[PDB]
Amino acid sequence: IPEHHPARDMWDTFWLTGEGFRLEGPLGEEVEGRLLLRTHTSPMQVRYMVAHTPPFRIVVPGRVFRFEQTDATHEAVFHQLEGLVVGEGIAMAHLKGAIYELAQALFGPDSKVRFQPVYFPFVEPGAQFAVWWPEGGKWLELGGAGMVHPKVFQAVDAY
Amino acid sequence: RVDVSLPGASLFSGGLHPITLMERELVEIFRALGYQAVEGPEVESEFFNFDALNIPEHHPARDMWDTFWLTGEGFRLEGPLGEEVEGRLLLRTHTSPMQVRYMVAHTPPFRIVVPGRVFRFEQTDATHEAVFHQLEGLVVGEGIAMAHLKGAIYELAQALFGPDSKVRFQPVYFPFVEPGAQFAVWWPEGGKWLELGGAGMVHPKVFQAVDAYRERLGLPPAYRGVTGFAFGLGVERLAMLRYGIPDIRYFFGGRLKFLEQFKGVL
Amino acid sequence: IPLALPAFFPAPDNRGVEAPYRKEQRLREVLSGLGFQEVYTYSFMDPEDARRFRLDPPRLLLLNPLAPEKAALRTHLFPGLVRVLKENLDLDRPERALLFEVGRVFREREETHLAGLLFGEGVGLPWAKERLSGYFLLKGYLEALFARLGLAFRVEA
Amino acid sequence: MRVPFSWLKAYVPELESPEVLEERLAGLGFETDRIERVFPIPRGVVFARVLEAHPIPGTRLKRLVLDAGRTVEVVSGAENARKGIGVALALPGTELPGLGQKVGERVIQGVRSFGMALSPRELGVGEYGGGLLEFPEDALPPGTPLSEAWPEEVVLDLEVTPNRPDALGLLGLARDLHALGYALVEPEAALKAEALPLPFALKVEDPEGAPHFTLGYAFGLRVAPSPLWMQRALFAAGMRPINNVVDVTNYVMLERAQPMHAFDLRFVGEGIAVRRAREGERLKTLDGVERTLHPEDLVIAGWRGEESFPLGLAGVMGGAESEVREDTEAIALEVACFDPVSIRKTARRHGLRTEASHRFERGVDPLGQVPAQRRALSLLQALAGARVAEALLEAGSPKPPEAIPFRPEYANRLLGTSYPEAEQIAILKRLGCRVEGEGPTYRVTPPSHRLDLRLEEDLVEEVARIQGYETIPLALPAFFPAPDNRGVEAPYRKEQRLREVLSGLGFQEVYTYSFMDPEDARRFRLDPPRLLLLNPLAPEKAALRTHLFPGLVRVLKENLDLDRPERALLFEVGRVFREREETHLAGLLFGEGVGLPWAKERLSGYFLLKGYLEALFARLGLAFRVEAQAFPFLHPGVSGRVLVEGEEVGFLGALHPEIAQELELPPVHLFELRLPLPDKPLAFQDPSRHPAAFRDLAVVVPAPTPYGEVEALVREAAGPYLESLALFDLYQGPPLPEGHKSLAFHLRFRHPKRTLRDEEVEEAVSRVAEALRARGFGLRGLDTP
Numbered sequence A: 001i002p003e004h005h006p007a008r009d010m011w012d013t014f015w016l017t018g019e020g021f022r023l024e025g026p027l028g029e030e031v032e033g034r035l036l037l038r039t040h041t042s043p044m045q046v047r048y049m050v051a052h053t054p055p056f057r058i059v060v061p062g063r064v065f066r067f068e069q070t071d072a073t074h075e076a077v078f079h080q081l082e083g084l085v086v087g088e089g090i091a092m093a094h095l096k097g098a099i100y101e102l103a104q105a106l107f108g109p110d111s112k113v114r115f116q117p118v119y120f121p122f123v124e125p126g127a128q129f130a131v132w133w134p135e136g137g138k139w140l141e142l143g144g145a146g147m148v149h150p151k152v153f154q155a156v157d158a159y
Numbered sequence B: 001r002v003d004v005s006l007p008g009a010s011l012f013s014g015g016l017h018p019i020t021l022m023e024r025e026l027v028e029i030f031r032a033l034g035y036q037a038v039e040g041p042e043v044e045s046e047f048f049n050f051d052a053l054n055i056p057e058h059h060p061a062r063d064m065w066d067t068f069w070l071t072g073e074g075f076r077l078e079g080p081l082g083e084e085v086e087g088r089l090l091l092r093t094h095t096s097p098m099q100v101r102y103m104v105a106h107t108p109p110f111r112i113v114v115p116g117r118v119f120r121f122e123q124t125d126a127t128h129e130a131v132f133h134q135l136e137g138l139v140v141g142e143g144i145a146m147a148h149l150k151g152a153i154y155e156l157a158q159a160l161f162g163p164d165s166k167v168r169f170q171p172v173y174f175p176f177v178e179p180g181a182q183f184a185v186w187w188p189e190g191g192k193w194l195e196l197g198g199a200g201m202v203h204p205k206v207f208q209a210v211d212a213y214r215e216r217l218g219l220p221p222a223y224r225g226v227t228g229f230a231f232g233l234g235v236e237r238l239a240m241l242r243y244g245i246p247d248i249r250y251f252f253g254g255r256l257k258f259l260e261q262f263k264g265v266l
Numbered sequence C: 001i002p003l004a005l006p007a008f009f010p011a012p013d014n015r016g017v018e019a020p021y022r023k024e025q026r027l028r029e030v031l032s033g034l035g036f037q038e039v040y041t042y043s044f045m046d047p048e049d050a051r052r053f054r055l056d057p058p059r060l061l062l063l064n065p066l067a068p069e070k071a072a073l074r075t076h077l078f079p080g081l082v083r084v085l086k087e088n089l090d091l092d093r094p095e096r097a098l099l100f101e102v103g104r105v106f107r108e109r110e111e112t113h114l115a116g117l118l119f120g121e122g123v124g125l126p127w128a129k130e131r132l133s134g135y136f137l138l139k140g141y142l143e144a145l146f147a148r149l150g151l152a153f154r155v156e157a
Numbered sequence D: 001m002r003v004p005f006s007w008l009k010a011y012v013p014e015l016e017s018p019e020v021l022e023e024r025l026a027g028l029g030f031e032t033d034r035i036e037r038v039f040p041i042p043r044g045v046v047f048a049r050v051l052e053a054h055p056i057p058g059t060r061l062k063r064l065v066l067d068a069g070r071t072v073e074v075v076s077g078a079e080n081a082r083k084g085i086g087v088a089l090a091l092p093g094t095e096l097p098g099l100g101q102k103v104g105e106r107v108i109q110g111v112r113s114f115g116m117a118l119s120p121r122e123l124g125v126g127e128y129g130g131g132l133l134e135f136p137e138d139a140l141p142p143g144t145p146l147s148e149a150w151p152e153e154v155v156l157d158l159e160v161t162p163n164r165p166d167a168l169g170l171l172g173l174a175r176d177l178h179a180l181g182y183a184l185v186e187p188e189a190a191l192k193a194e195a196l197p198l199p200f201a202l203k204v205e206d207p208e209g210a211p212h213f214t215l216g217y218a219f220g221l222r223v224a225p226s227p228l229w230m231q232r233a234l235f236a237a238g239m240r241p242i243n244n245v246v247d248v249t250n251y252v253m254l255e256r257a258q259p260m261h262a263f264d265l266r267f268v269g270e271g272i273a274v275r276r277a278r279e280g281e282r283l284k285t286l287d288g289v290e291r292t293l294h295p296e297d298l299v300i301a302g303w304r305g306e307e308s309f310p311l312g313l314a315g316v317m318g319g320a321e322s323e324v325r326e327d328t329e330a331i332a333l334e335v336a337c338f339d340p341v342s343i344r345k346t347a348r349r350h351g352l353r354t355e356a357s358h359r360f361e362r363g364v365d366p367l368g369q370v371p372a373q374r375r376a377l378s379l380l381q382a383l384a385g386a387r388v389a390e391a392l393l394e395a396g397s398p399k400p401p402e403a404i405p406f407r408p409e410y411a412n413r414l415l416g417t418s419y420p421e422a423e424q425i426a427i428l429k430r431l432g433c434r435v436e437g438e439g440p441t442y443r444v445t446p447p448s449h450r451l452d453l454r455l456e457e458d459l460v461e462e463v464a465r466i467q468g469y470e471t472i473p474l475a476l477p478a479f480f481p482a483p484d485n486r487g488v489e490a491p492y493r494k495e496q497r498l499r500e501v502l503s504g505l506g507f508q509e510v511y512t513y514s515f516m517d518p519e520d521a522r523r524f525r526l527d528p529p530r531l532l533l534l535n536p537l538a539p540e541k542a543a544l545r546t547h548l549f550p551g552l553v554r555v556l557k558e559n560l561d562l563d564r565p566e567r568a569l570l571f572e573v574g575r576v577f578r579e580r581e582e583t584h585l586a587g588l589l590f591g592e593g594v595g596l597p598w599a600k601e602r603l604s605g606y607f608l609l610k611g612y613l614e615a616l617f618a619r620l621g622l623a624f625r626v627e628a629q630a631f632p633f634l635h636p637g638v639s640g641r642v643l644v645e646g647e648e649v650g651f652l653g654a655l656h657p658e659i660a661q662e663l664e665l666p667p668v669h670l671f672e673l674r675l676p677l678p679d680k681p682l683a684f685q686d687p688s689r690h691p692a693a694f695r696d697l698a699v700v701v702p703a704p705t706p707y708g709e710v711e712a713l714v715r716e717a718a719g720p721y722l723e724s725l726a727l728f729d730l731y732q733g734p735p736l737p738e739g740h741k742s743l744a745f746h747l748r749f750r751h752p753k754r755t756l757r758d759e760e761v762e763e764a765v766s767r768v769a770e771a772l773r774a775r776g777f778g779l780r781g782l783d784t785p
């Protein structure tokens, strides 16, 4: 997600200021760059990969921040759960399988999932998904997902 | 002013029994491999503890177990589907019967793990109890192989003792599996093998006993075209070497001085 | 024989099969969290204790008991906890104790029980004199327990 | 983006219905937020021709003589009411979509107005209400119900993600639908051009800004209202028709994501110059806003002799001057591709967001210009009767897109599918890709209009969405994780047990925003925040909290004002920022305390909190002690530091009074520690089975001495056989030394291998009395039974 491009304009970032603040990298190194409050848990996806080697399966809950109006379904401060599974032969069918399991586990056997294409500079294919809530009779748009982008893997090894 | 170093109100601080702690860690480990924890009854029928598991009476196989037989009427023992099961009552000599109970009540594929209190009429020393705990594992499904059984135990070892840990399987006998095996895990910090338990590919007759019982109950057969592995390991044995407990007899001693030492351990 | 891991979507009726187990386990943890100390006691019972503790006699007995003091299957959990209290008192001299035990009991049907025990001076400032204890202390912890469990709780005479 | 069903249906004739369309776009990757039915037009509204428009003396109104089948008269104050145009007549008796006052015949300024001529807003087709709808005078036979030429429309509100700029054009959308199998109808730009020179020149002074720039030439123009089909189309898309020429430029823009602008030649002078503005250079835009340009703004300028003037904001908005009005006869048609970054900057700089900037920012087909010129010119010839030059002025030569390697096998592998090779290639071709090679790794070069197709992966996403994501099977992966992934979840598990234990002990968890009020650094006497926000939600949230207690205190206050809790035991675990980001655990006790609800005696305050903490660390199996230390935010009398396993991790005490008072709060007790807590590995200690030794003794100590100091001295000299050391009584008064206090101590000794001989016992009780008094303390009682 490079600067001054439509992609950046999708996120409402909280920028920070102040010196003497030490931000450590995946390997305790001192990382530089403009400080900010994470707009999503996704960065932990790059932090983990530089610090570990595949194959693996992680899940990372976390507090995220976005400068936007708070209504009944929107907060400027909320929580996300990232999931990342990397390894030889990993496919979108596995991604669908995972979410299918989430649904079954969350709403029982009469539950189901739905994936539709959506955009994320960090995946390709990209997708948004919903789970069928049988007791409430309606789809719930839970989150976004996809096959980790080639450039993300490149950024990781480059780092 | 106040002397802040002074003792505060003596609120009680609890703790969990070591067996509970060890059971929890084992269940956590197998849960990560997709296993679900279910329990069975301590007072079991001879049918589930033996016959169903291919251990008939008056044969060398029976003579391997030291069974506690029970007596008394008015006692109701319910089966896998709440039915009233009959047969000579006894204290389960192992968690294995829960392997038949679960299969008649469910359909493959699945992965269960079943911790439980077991009983055996034998002399109690520093590594033997008449009352201890086991953890059964059962994975049934199309294409299940012994390589999966080895994989499971390999995971147990890694999870229990780190990357420099390893497993060892040797052939052994159990009327309820074929191939049959006993296994040990390499404890790197202690430099020695630990014989954890027995395992193998669920026996053809066990699957037959299950569906046969399912039919009596009016259920369709469900284990004709599947295979599976199962294992049974000693919880106390693992807890001892894991928490450094020297005598198995401490577990049921009830001594607070002993128990309180695990308030920290999770 | 190589090492491998199986992969499959479990059959429908295997879902949620672990709620019972999870339930009991949270209970123990909550209890250990509240302040109770867990204790494990043999399932055996001394046929004479049915008298000493004024309980209906055991329904299940052993045809081959380890000893006559263990010739029956316990019908309650408190007798056992009381005995461990006595035993603990004679070995070490605890000034108090807050114990609990979850275990199988046999009578008509095999069932799971939860028992607890409070003993001693109670709670208060170690150096001071005033203290909370006895009946209303135990009920205090129980009320806290059921509140933490989100359940209605009352005791009638 | 608005998607008028029937408009899209012009390119995709077989569309089943707006509902199925929505379904189809969802699968393609386009979510519709809503669907509307939009042009309900009552029967009473008919087409009318304005035969004549007469001004009513002394008023700003006109009496319009209309031909609406029969001749009728109508009064209007609309500045555009004039003869020679068609209008929307609402005959008396009509119910207009939004005025509820059934239109009737009424007398106005001397004339009987038989109904009224409508504005876009009155008819209900647009928001504009400042003038009448202007139809072509001959659009329909006078009197025919407008419904007949203006049927209702269903409009979908489509989300078009940044990666599909080609979808900002209805034709782009139609091509995607085509990939699904639908027949595609592309408009034919039937042109009757003439080979003559263009009466103006093109000078592209800043190619970086305008990589590809073209100018079309159309003359002999007969500017007039657009046809009903086109006005209905634009209105449905949220735009307002102006006239022939302008309307065409907007229509095509929406059709193929290609902004274009028509400049009246009267103002171009000798030619068009694409360049940066000079500092201060002024330009009045079409919105009628006088603006000042930045030397960074790219502009469409004109020049005459030595003077150069701006005609419009390149890629953003056209100049007010150059708009095409009715007396316009010839224009220069701008159809270009601008540098996205430049447009982006400029649009921001003047606070503008137009259909044009929006598209140029997201990107435009680097080679769609000439095809777009043909479409617009073709339409101008058909609607404004324009004569069109055969040539175009063209600058910049964009390179076609490169080939992308594509393996049908990799597509199926990455997706976990097994689509046959043929289907994959057939699909890529339907999307306009060229496919070369016999396999297994083909050469696929995408259509210049797809800016989002550069990698093989992009190509596989194409196959998946056209095939349909639901055709991708479900599966679960199986593998032994790499070694360094083992035990990676201990940290997380640790913190989680902590929370649970806390919730178990009796603490109620609370979540509070990470933000901090810069003023609270003062109110709570803390060092000021190290991190502040350049864009705070509000000034009370302009910093990142450095502590957790301030927040908990505020929630206490807030809770007290809303409900009146008699007490509270709270805790919170969260990130704090100062020098480094760290995790804290804070807790709060407030109220009467614990005891019998009906009785009076109670345990509470400082020693209650410390009570719970001691229980906590015992349950966690960790050493815990509190030593007196001063803390700005704590009560000088009740303030101490927390030591876990002998290391300082935080504090415990009562909230400083002054602070409580400034916040109007009763006394409050609290603590805050740094996580993760110290680790102490289980070292099982086989407890001795022999009887223990019991001995009591008191220690007279000066009142100022801290209990912990005594406790430590007693334990030290107590010897290696000390099992337990407990404090059972604290007293100060008679018969003790004024300013002194005694401490009742319960001691216990025990030997692992055998019982202890009184020699060993008393001997130790002595070594204690020695260092005890050698320190300066008296031994009131000794060997006490």
Ligand SMILES: Nc1ncnc2c1ncn2[C@@H]1O[C@H](COS(=O)(=O)NC(=O)[C@@H](N)Cc2ccc(O)cc2)[C@@H](O)[C@H]1O
Binding pocket: A039, A040, A041, A042, A066, A068, A073, A074, A075, A076, A078, A080, A120, A122, A123, A141, A142, A143, A144, A145, A146, A147, A148
């Ligand atoms: N302001 C807000 N308040 C509350 N919840 C909010 C929110 N903004 C977003 N959310 C929730 O956050 C979820 C995902 O947020 S998102 O901005 O749409 N998508 C992301 O942030 C991406 N990181 C998602 C993602 C996509 C692909 C991946 O491979 C990994 C992650 C949504 O589905 C929504 O339920």
Ligand SMILES: Nc1ncnc2c1ncn2[C@@H]1O[C@H](COS(=O)(=O)NC(=O)[C@@H](N)Cc2ccc(O)cc2)[C@@H](O)[C@H]1O
Binding pocket: B093, B094, B095, B096, B120, B122, B127, B128, B129, B130, B132, B134, B174, B176, B177, B195, B196, B197, B198, B199, B200, B201, B202, B229, B230, B231, B232, B233, B234, B236, B237, B248
């Ligand atoms: N008296 C005793 N006290 C304490 N622990 C004891 C014990 N008797 C046995 N154990 C523990 O129990 C474990 C298994 O017990 S065993 O009698 O050898 N084997 C069984 O009971 C079988 N049910 C094991 C089994 C074999 C194959 C399967 O597919 C499933 C299970 C041992 O490895 C040992 O560690």
Ligand SMILES: [Mn+2]
Binding pocket: A124, D163, D452, D453, D458, D461
């Ligand atoms: Mn793409």
